[PDB]
Amino acid sequence: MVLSEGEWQLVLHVWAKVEADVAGHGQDILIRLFKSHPETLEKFDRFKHLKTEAEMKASEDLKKGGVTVLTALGAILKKKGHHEAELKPLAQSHATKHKIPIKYLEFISEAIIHVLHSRHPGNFGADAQGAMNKALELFRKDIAAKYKELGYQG
Numbered sequence: 001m002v003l004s005e006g007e008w009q010l011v012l013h014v015w016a017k018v019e020a021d022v023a024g025h026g027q028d029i030l031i032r033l034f035k036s037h038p039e040t041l042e043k044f045d046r047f048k049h050l051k052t053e054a055e056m057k058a059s060e061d062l063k064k065g066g067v068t069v070l071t072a073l074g075a076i077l078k079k080k081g082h083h084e085a086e087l088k089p090l091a092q093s094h095a096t097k098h099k100i101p102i103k104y105l106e107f108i109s110e111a112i113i114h115v116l117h118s119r120h121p122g123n124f125g126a127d128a129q130g131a132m133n134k135a136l137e138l139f140r141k142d143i144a145a146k147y148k149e150l151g152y153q154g
């Protein structure tokens with residue numbers, strides 16, 4: 001699949017706003033994932049013991065977690081499809097270390113879109129959301145291809 005430069009533009013334009021506060025978007029996102037899909041939390045040995053959102057909110061390890069995710073993702077989008085290199089190490093830990101099924105990747109893509117829709121209504125109309133979805137789906141499709149090569153699901 002291939003995004004046009006116009007789609008990249010839309011993506012990168014909302015991303016510039018997320019980057020005004022990485023930590024906070026980082027929190028909203030993981031908390032969204034964990035509330036919608038409680039099972040994903042079990043994957044996180046360092047977070048499984050958090051019972052409530054309030055606790056999620058106060059956890060400094062979660063906030064750090066979110067910045068890492070967003071910074072890794074950001075570094076991938078800014079590549080505009082040329083992200084082979086960046087993806088390798090990321091697919092290897094997720095498939096062989098963490099053991100994250102593609103399905104959980106879908107869940108987070110969902111939470112990312114949800115949060116950008118609440119926080120940047122003016123920068124995240126129908127077109128911009130269509131463009132981020134396409135960018136996230138390209139992300140997943142490639143990570144899925146790498147998984148397969150590393151000997152996981154596929």
Ligand code: HEM
Pocket residue numbers: 040041043044045046068069070072073089090093094097098100104105108
């Ligand atoms: C946008 C998609 C994702 C990005 C860019 C991302 C990125 C990262 C990065 C950069 C790290 C640190 C180094 C590493 O192990 O590779 C990490 C760790 C981790 N990720 Fe992800 N991740 C994503 C999705 C997921 C999902 C959806 C889950 C679980 C449902 C998850 C589970 C984990 C786990 C369990 C660790 C280890 C945490 C720790 O103990 O330090 N990842 N991820």
